[PDB]
Design an enzyme around this catalytic site. Structure first.
Site, PDB file in Angstrom:
ATOM      1  N   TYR B  26       9.402   8.565 -40.284  1.00  0.00           N
ATOM      2  CA  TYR B  26       9.200   7.425 -39.404  1.00  0.00           C
ATOM      3  C   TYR B  26      10.506   7.028 -38.735  1.00  0.00           C
ATOM      4  CZ  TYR B  26      11.449   4.357 -42.795  1.00  0.00           C
ATOM      5  OH  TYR B  26      12.353   3.759 -43.637  1.00  0.00           O
ATOM      6  N   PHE B  36      16.050   0.179 -35.743  1.00  0.00           N
ATOM      7  CA  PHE B  36      16.626  -0.432 -36.931  1.00  0.00           C
ATOM      8  C   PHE B  36      16.468   0.401 -38.192  1.00  0.00           C
ATOM      9  CE2 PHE B  36      12.245  -1.911 -36.877  1.00  0.00           C
ATOM     10  CZ  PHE B  36      11.857  -1.737 -38.186  1.00  0.00           C
ATOM     11  N   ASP B  37      15.624   1.429 -38.183  1.00  0.00           N
ATOM     12  CA  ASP B  37      15.434   2.262 -39.362  1.00  0.00           C
ATOM     13  C   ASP B  37      14.910   3.622 -38.932  1.00  0.00           C
ATOM     14  OD1 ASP B  37      15.483   3.031 -41.977  1.00  0.00           O
ATOM     15  OD2 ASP B  37      13.710   1.900 -42.590  1.00  0.00           O
ATOM     16  N   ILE B  56       4.892  -2.693 -46.138  1.00  0.00           N
ATOM     17  CA  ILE B  56       4.297  -3.833 -45.455  1.00  0.00           C
ATOM     18  C   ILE B  56       2.823  -3.553 -45.163  1.00  0.00           C
ATOM     19  CG2 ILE B  56       6.397  -4.817 -44.501  1.00  0.00           C
ATOM     20  CD1 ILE B  56       5.838  -3.224 -41.933  1.00  0.00           C
ATOM     21  N   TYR B  82       7.409  -8.468 -41.759  1.00  0.00           N
ATOM     22  CA  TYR B  82       8.176  -9.399 -42.575  1.00  0.00           C
ATOM     23  C   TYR B  82       8.001 -10.857 -42.161  1.00  0.00           C
ATOM     24  CZ  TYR B  82      10.381  -5.158 -44.236  1.00  0.00           C
ATOM     25  OH  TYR B  82      10.614  -3.919 -44.784  1.00  0.00           O
ATOM     26  N   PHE B  99       6.705   1.463 -34.908  1.00  0.00           N
ATOM     27  CA  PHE B  99       7.079   2.592 -35.747  1.00  0.00           C
ATOM     28  C   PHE B  99       6.506   3.868 -35.158  1.00  0.00           C
ATOM     29  CE2 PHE B  99       7.555  -0.881 -38.741  1.00  0.00           C
ATOM     30  CZ  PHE B  99       8.716  -0.540 -39.398  1.00  0.00           C
TER      31      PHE B  99
END
Lengths: 820, 107, 371, 49, 387
Positions: B26, B36-37, B56, B82, B99
């Site tokens: 991902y 961010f990831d 999540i 979140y 994502f």
């Protein structure tokens, strides 16, 4: 966007970005693993690994990215491991038994001129493992409340790949330095070498390198000295001073590994030799018992050893260095020779037992440091200190082992798991020494202290705890928080209460622990100028526990410490408590609550094991009379109302609200002023009665004893004691319909107040005349005994007042009647 | 919540079931497009068990709808992400997440 | 006892291992004698390949020993509230002090050769700034006793032994050039911290020794607590020995400087400070004599305390003698107007009475000889 | 990073994507400016949108 | 106005410094003699020890310091020998009184009263008053003798500088307060003239005075210079020059720009507003730089400093002051708050990419090897996620 390599010419952006990397390091500095995990989202693993190998990166950015990788992923683990690397807890396992000073070799299995490669081989000293967590920002966030969740672990990065990359980069740097190119990676030799060397040193200290990796590192440092049984190592490359400092760090690590190997070899030899000594002693005892014992004197002389303490037995059995007969030391010649051989091997390994190439780590370090100092006037004070420390370690190898041994400790296999848990908790506590206290740190400290106190190894190895210095670390944390805003109401009272519960049991665990804590009594008394409102254990409680029931320490007590406590008591007797005034209590002019605490400490200082310590008692009495305010307003010479009047006024205060408290309550309305006054005066009378001299001294007629008793009698009249003892107590009753009307023990005159008066009467005045005995019995004792007997019914039997009366009668009154 | 938009088709038959471990790759971005990831940055697939509340809610449902071998874009609202707390220092409060998830396998 | 019969062979293996490690360290490792100080100092003093360095410029680069001394001088000169305990400095100061050895009838030639050997060993250090380093460290201690100042004083004594005139000149020149009051302020503070005989401490120690054991020696402390009476007698002797060695050889300039530092903003009379300490010690010794006057014989502990006090007093008397000999007329006048006469009166009383007391028991002949 | 592949048309004067950095996060191709118009299978690219 | 015997750290401050002034101009620097009349002047305040009929022993102004009130002498003993007269000598004269050694009784010449300490008032010990009021009494006590201790040239010069600078800056503050809230319209400034030139020159001289030592110096010389600088900073702070500088900064900060200042002070005065503000901030930075004691003062009024970070006239100077405070004082680090951190980040937002702001943020995280988790978390939460 642009290529980051454009910052070689865009200097303003270069400076700003280097300072941004510095800011990242600062925000994740000193164990902020949560912020490290956050930073993993901004500078990811791929970026960091690419920056490590980027040969065109400007020097400042190269150094910044190396430092950022270390800060995010390795700094916490390296610090935790370094904190533990100075101690040697050796488990007695087969791996430990197999350890030898010198490697088994054809030239000589033990004793040969050739050491093993430093940092290579089997090490058994306990070191807690590294803990990491994966960086991931899609996991469900834990709903658990803040300041309660487990502390975040350092973000993980593949350590095998990282170490391989570090070794490859160091090799490439060495090769390029050999070639002497005009475009060094990072712009200079320093920017090429210092970051890679920092990474390698960090990984080495973390202990992630394998034996082959350590051998490669050693060969890079010096191909010839560390050859296994390019041709120029790092130590001879004409390197700058910063690179020399990094090389000094590497050499420091390898010297530390050599010292650890020496300690572990000593531990293994100790295991084997102690087994042999114990077997020999058992055999000798068997022979002695089976002997006819023709000479009773001979049998007694032989049994002297076996009746001696084990430590003395060991000392006697080892006292044969300069020769001894089979009478001063019955150890057989074979075992003596084994010890002598091991001692010779140890001296040879340290170099004590007594070429243009060094041929050893010690010679290499010595020659390198001396050559550097001879070649240049070193300008870096850090470099100078590092190289001269290394030189001192090389020249004094036996001294280094001697100074390291106090921190060595052997344990059995069954204790390994609990020792590892204790080491983890101690590591957390130590890590909390570099961060300002907050709610999360307080919670972690409390949890770690609880785990340590529930750990069995804590109670069974007090010497190990003292060697680890657990008490000093806990005291340092406590004093940090206490000093933080000393005048302002100290925060984290729960953690300070735990700071006793730990230290303040620690004094009790063993007598040596008590002495070690007693060594810090002045510091504790320095920081004990506050408290009371804590409603829990305090540094004054630590001070009391460090001297309680220890005659040796009580005699070692210092008049300066007693004076400091008496000065605190004088302040308490002259000024009201600001905390109570803020809470809204009436201003009575003094602080009975704090006075009682200081009087309790003085009581524990002057009374030991049921007897009065004459020196401390006399010093305390002299100090108290030199500062009469310590006696409270009642015993004031000019306007004092007397002890009896003071107690009666306190009872009236207790009965009258708006004079006993704020009158506008975590525990019984916090404090009640009447009860506080009664408790202060009871504690003062108890302290004076315990300062009273002993009967044997009085019979001997010592002038000091007679003078002290006269002073105490002048201070406290007998009639006041009798009146207080005769004052009536409030007993439980039945009212309304089955309503148990009981007194509030925390706000009323209680039998514990009469107990101090009885103790003073018995120790200072004593009962010697039948008329006085009958008078005191008729007025004070018999009414209380009758009340206690009447409260024996099923309803009142277990009431607080009934139990207090039973304790009073069985501890003060009845023993006196038996004596009389 | 979560919207699933296919990028590359999967097999169309094998869908994750509760208790199965989904192994995925991902890349995560904010609604405005800031990454961010990414598991591809760490070069290691991310594994999570369905129904264990490990990830999540948006991820749970979207990967549940996804099929083996499929690449898809998951758009997850704040409530399924979140939410108001966010991820301090990474994800701002009340942030929609995007994502790019590839369902490598089930195990 | 026989009922107890605690054998070593019944102890758990790990406990026995720990006890063996302690005993082995105490008796076999600690007792080992290994002298490396001279070799280390020689190696550090040797320069290398000065020809390759081609240091024809007058300013030669310092050799390794010089650089070490310079590093410690920098540490001492750093502006700080307190002097932190430095194990490295203490170790190297001990090494340097031991490098100056200060080693039947010996011939005049042999005595001269020994003196020259000691002078060369001391020059190895004082040519590298060791004297200034010692003064700087004394100043930096700021009057606080401890291992740092103890090592500094020992090093100063080592380099001043025999009345080294060159070292005295270097120290005096440095002090008069810096014109800093901190050095003598620290000296005065240390002198005031020096202790004397304490009868209360003596009684407490007697009681502690009286307390007996009931358990294993390891479990109990054995009442081996460090001496409570004149526990710093070694430091006191070192301090007054250093002050004496500053004036040894009748150094008139340094004798005058110890009395008055003309160039400084404030001056401290070290002669009167010494007299004050001597008076305190004399009063303590008189108290001890009064304590023991009634008793027929002085016990071993009291004898040892008397001997320690007498050794300290001997050192102080030697220091005053070195202050005034030559003669230094100013120091003579200051002593004549000081409280020295009262101290001498008290000492005469103590001497007169202790002579007669000790002559009555031959078991105290050594103490009588020392007195 | 996901492989980039786009097809389309571009204007001669104005379409000059140089290697390396550029608009947005770099990797500029067809449709990353207002001089080109690209298709990648799922999106129509123009003006870096 | 009152004189005390005090023995705390005041023995190293400037308020305990006095100047002996003989009653003559020629040969006033001659050796002091027993019984010689003289005045005793307080250096930092410029007031003279004297006897007033209504208050007794006090320090009076030079305007009221006539000989009868302010004339004292040193006497070897309290015996009544003053009958013996003395004649002036045209030269250095005989050396009589010695520093440190000589014990002297201070006697008021006109009345003959002896300088002594007032009877210890009750409850002073309880209040913690370690200082004893000094008075002039007919008899005094036996321990009234005083010892004269020499002070360093550095301390004497610093005390005189403090006196002059305090006078000048108080005059400046009075001038500003004169027209504080009186717009001039188009007429004259409507107030007292401002000592602009004197203030500027004094500020520049003090900045040069407090300039830190050059890094290109030997270690020993640098340490001596640092010690002197710290001592002088402490002297000025203890005499209250830091508070005076802060007051001047406040008065000038009431105005947002040079034109706004001109609306009340006039164009000529406003021509120096920016220069004076920048010089004041520079002097504050010099006064607190490297001094933990001076930097810790801001732990109580940190908002005073942080609220000014966005001022555009002295942005760099204010940032430098904040940097010094944060670098030196952990106490400020422990009271830093989220609003302060947000203001510092807004500095980056509104002034550009300045690495000094990043340095300030870095210093907010760790001081002297101890990390502040709250500061670290606040910076991470308020700076990073926005990207």
């Amino acid at each position: 966007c642009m290529d980051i390599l454009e910052l070689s010419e865009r200097l303003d952006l270069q400076r700003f970005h280097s300072h941004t990397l510095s800011l990242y390091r600062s925000v994740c500095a000193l164990g902020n693993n949560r912020v490290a995990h956050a930073l993993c989202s901004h500078v990811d693993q791929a970026q960091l690994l690419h920056a490590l190998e980027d040969a065109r990166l400007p020097g400042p950015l190269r150094a910044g990215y190396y430092d950022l990788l270390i800060s995010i992923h390795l700094e916490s683990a390296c610090r935790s491991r370094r904190s533990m690397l100075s101690e040697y807890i050796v488990p007695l396992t087969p791996e430990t038994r197999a350890i030898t000073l010198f490697p088994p070799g054809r030239s000589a299995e033990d004793g040969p001129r050739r050491h093993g490669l430093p940092g290579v081989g089997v090490t058994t000293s306990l070191r807690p493992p590294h803990h990491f967590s994966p960086p991931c920002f899609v996991v469900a966030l834990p709903a658990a409340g803040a300041t309660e969740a487990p502390a975040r672990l350092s973000p993980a990065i593949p350590l095998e790949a990282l170490r391989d990359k570090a070794l490859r980069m160091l090799g490439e740097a060495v090769r390029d330095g050999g070639q002497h190119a005009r475009d060094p990676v990072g712009g200079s030799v320093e920017f090429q070498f210092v970051p890679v060397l920092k990474l390698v040193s960090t990984l080495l200290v973390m202990g992630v390198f394998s034996d082959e990796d350590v051998k490669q590192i050693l060969k890079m440092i010096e191909p010839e000295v560390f050859r296994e049984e390019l041709e120029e190592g790092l130590l001879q490359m004409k390197l700058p001073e910063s690179v020399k400092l990094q090389m000094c760090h590497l050499l420091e690590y390898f010297c530390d590994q050599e010292l650890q190997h020496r300690v572990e070899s000593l531990a293994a030899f100790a295991e084997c030799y102690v087994d042999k000594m114990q077997g020999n002693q058992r055999g000798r005892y068997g022979l002695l018992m089976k002997a006819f014992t023709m000479s009773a004197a001979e049998t007694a002389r032989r049994t002297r050893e076996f009746r001696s303490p084990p430590q003395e037995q060991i000392n006697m059995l080892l006292h044969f260095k300069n020769g001894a007969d089979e009478e001063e030391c019955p150890l057989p010649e074979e075992i003596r020779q084994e010890l002598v051989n091991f001692h010779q091997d140890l001296l040879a390994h340290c170099g004590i037992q007594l070429e243009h190439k060094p041929q050893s780590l010690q010679e290499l370090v010595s020659h390198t440091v001396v050559r550097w100092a001879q070649e240049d006037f070193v300008q870096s004070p850090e470099l100078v200190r590092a190289m001269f420390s290394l030189l001192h370690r090389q020249y004094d190898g036996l001294g280094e082992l001697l100074r390291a041994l106090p921190r060595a400790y052997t344990i059995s296999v069954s204790s390994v798991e609990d020792t590892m848990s204790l080491l983890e908790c101690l590591g957390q506590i130590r890590s909390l020494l570099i961060v300002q206290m907050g709610p999360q740190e307080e919670n972690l400290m409390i949890q770690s202290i609880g785990n340590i106190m529930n750990n069995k190894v804590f109670y069974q190895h007090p010497n190990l705890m003292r060697a680890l210095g657990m008490h000093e670390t806990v005291m340092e944390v406590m004093v940090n928080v206490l000093g933080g805003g000393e005048s302002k109401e100290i925060r984290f009272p729960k953690m300070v209460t735990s700071c006793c519960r730990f230290l303040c049991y620690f004094c009790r665990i063993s007598r040596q622990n008590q002495r070690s804590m007693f060594d810090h009594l002045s510091y504790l008394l320095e920081n004990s100028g506050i408290g009371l409102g804590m409603q829990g254990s305090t540094p004054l409680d630590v001070a009391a526990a460090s001297v309680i029931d220890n005659n040796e320490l009580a005699l070692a007590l210092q008049e300066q410490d007693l004076e400091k406590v008496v000065s605190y008591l004088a302040g308490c007797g002259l000024q009201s408590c600001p905390m109570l005034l803020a809470k809204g209590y009436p201003d009575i002019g003094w602080n009975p609550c704090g006075g009682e605490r200081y009087l309790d400490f003085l009581r524990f200082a002057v009374f030991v094991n049921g007897e009065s310590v004459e020196e401390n008692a006399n010093v305390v009495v002299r100090l108290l009379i030199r500062k009469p305010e310590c006696f409270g307003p009642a015993l004031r010479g000019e306007g004092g109302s007397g002890l009896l009047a003071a107690i009666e006024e306190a009872i009236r205060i207790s009965e009258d609200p708006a004079r006993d408290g704020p009158g506008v309550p975590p525990e019984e309305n916090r404090v009640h002023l009447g009860h506080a006054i009664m408790s202060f005066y009871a504690a003062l009378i108890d302290l004076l009665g315990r300062c009273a001299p002993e009967t044997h001294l009085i019979q001997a007629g010592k002038g000091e004893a007679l003078r002290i008793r006269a002073i105490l009698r002048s201070l406290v009249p007998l009639d006041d004691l009798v009146g207080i003892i005769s004052l009536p107590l409030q007993i439980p009753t039945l009212g309304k319909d089955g309503a148990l009307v009981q007194p509030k023990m925390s706000a009323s005159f209680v039998p514990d107040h009469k107990a101090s008066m009885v103790l003073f009467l018995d120790r200072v005045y004593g009962i010697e005349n039948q008329d006085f005995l009958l008078h005191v019995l008729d007025v004070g004792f018999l009414p209380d005994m009758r009340a206690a007997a009447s409260l024996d019914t099923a309803t009142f039997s277990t009431t607080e007042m009934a139990l207090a009366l039973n304790r009073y009668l069985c501890l003060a009154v009845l023993p006196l009647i038996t004596k009389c | 919540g979560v919207q699933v938009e296919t990028i590359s088709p999967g097999d169309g038959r094998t869908f994750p079931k509760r208790g199965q471990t989904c192994v995925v790759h991902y890349t995560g971005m904010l609604e405005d497009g800031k990454k961010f990831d990414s598991s591809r940055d760490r070069n290691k697939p991310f594994k999570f068990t369905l129904g264990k509340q490990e990830v999540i809610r948006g991820w749970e449902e979207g990967v549940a709808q996804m099929s083996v071998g499929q690449r898809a874009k998951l758009i997850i609202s704040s409530d399924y992400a979140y939410g108001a707390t966010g991820h301090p220092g990474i994800i701002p409060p009340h942030a929609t997440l995007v994502f790019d998830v590839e369902l490598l396998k089930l195990e | 006892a026989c009922f107890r019969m605690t054998p070593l062979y019944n102890l758990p293996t790990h406990r026995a291992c720990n006890m063996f490690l302690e005993s082995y360290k105490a008796s076999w490792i600690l007792t080992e004698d290994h002298s490396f100080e001279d070799r280390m100092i020689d190696d550090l003093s040797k320069a290398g390949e000065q020809e390759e360095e081609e240091e024809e410029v007058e300013e030669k680069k310092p050799d390794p020993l010089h650089q070490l001394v310079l590093h410690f001088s920098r540490t001492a000169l750093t502006e700080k509230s307190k002097l932190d305990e430095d194990y490295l400095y203490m170790a190297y100061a001990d090494i340097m002090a031991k490098s100056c050895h200060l080693e039947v009838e010996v011939s005049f030639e042999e005595k001269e050769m020994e003196k020259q050997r000691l002078l060369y060993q001391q020059s190895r250090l004082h040519n590298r700034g060791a004297a200034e380093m010692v003064l700087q460290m004394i100043s930096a201690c700021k009057g606080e006793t401890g291992a740092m100042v103890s090592s500094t004083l020992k090093l100063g004594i080592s380099i001043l032994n025999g009345g080294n005139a060159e070292v005295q000149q270097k120290m005096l020149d440095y002090l008069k050039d810096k014109k800093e009051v901190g050095f003598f302020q620290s000296i005065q503070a240390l002198m005031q911290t020096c202790s004397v005989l304490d009868l209360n401490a003596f009684e407490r120690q007697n009681k502690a020794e009286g307390l007996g054991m009931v358990n294993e020696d390891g479990t109990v402390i054995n009442r081996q607590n460090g001496e409570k009476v004149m526990a710093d007698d070694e430091f006191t002797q070192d301090l007054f020995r250093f002050l004496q060695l500053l004036c040894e050889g009748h150094n008139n300039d340094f004798q005058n400087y110890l009395r008055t530092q003309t160039g400084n903003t404030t001056t401290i009379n070290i002669i009167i400070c010494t007299v004050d300490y001597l008076l305190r010690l004399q009063e303590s010794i008189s108290d001890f004599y009064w304590y023991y006057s009634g008793k027929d014989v002085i016990e071993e502990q009291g004898k040892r305390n008397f001997s320690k006090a007498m050794s300290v007093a001997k050192q102080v008397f030697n220091s005053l003698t070195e202050y005034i000999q030559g003669p230094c007329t100013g120091n003579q006048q200051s002593l004549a107007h000081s409280r020295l006469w009262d101290a001498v009166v008290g000492f005469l009383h103590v001497f007169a009475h202790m002579m007669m007391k000790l002559a009555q028991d031959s078991s105290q002949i050594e103490l009588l000889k020392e007195l | 990073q996901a492989t980039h592949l786009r097809v389309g048309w571009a204007l001669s004067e104005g379409y000059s994507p140089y290697p390396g950095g550029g608009e947005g996060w770099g990797g500029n191709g067809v449709g990353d400016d207002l001089y080109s118009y690209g298709f990648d299978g799922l999106h129509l690219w123009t003006g870096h949108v | 106005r009152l004189v005390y015997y005090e023995g705390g750290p005041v023995c190293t401050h400037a308020r305990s410094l006095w100047r002996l002034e003989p009653l003559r101009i020629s040969w006033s620097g001659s050796h002091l003699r027993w019984g010689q009349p003289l005045r005793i002047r307080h250096v930092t305040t410029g007031r003279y020890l004297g006897l007033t009929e209504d208050q007794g022993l006090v320090v009076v102004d030079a305007s009221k310091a006539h000989t009868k009130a302010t004339s004292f002498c040193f006497r070897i003993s309290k015996e009544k020998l003053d009958v013996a007269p003395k004649r002036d000598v045209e030269g250095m004269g005989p050396p009589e009184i010695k520093y440190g050694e000589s014990l002297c009784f201070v006697q008021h010449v006109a009345s003959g009263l002896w300088l002594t300490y007032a009877a210890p008032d009750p409850k002073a010990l309880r209040l913690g008053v370690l200082k004893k009021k000094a008075m002039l009494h007919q008899e005094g006590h036996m321990d009234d003798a005083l010892s004269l201790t020499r002070c360093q040239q550095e301390e004497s010069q610093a005390a005189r500088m403090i006196y002059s600078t305090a006078g000048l800056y108080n005059q400046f503050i009075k001038g500003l307060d004169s027209f504080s809230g009186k717009p001039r319209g188009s007429g004259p400034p409507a107030g007292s003239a401002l000592p602009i030139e004197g203030v500027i020159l004094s500020l520049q001289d003090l900045i040069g005075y407090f300039e830190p030592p050059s890094e290109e110096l030997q270690h020993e010389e640098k340490q001596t210079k640092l010690r002197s600088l710290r001592n002088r900073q402490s002297l000025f702070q203890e005499e209250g020059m830091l508070s005076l500088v802060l007051n001047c900064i406040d008065r000038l900060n009431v105005y947002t720009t040079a034109a706004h200042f001109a609306e009340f002070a006039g164009e000529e005065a406003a021509e120096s507003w920016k220069e004076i503000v920048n010089l004041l901030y520079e002097l504050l930075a010099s006064l607190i730089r490297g001094n933990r004691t001076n930097c810790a003062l801001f732990s109580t009024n940190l908002d005073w400093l942080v609220s000014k970070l966005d001022r555009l006239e002295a942005s760099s100077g204010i940032l430098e002051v904040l940097y010094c405070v944060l670098i030196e004082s952990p106490e400020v680090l422990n009271i830093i708050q989220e609003n302060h951190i947000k203001s510092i980040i807004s500095l980056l937002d509104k002034h550009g990419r300045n690495h000094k702001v990043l340095d300030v943020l870095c210093s907010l995280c760790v001081c002297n090897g101890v990390a502040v988790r709250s500061n670290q978390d606040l910076i991470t939460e308020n700076l990073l996620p926005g990207r």
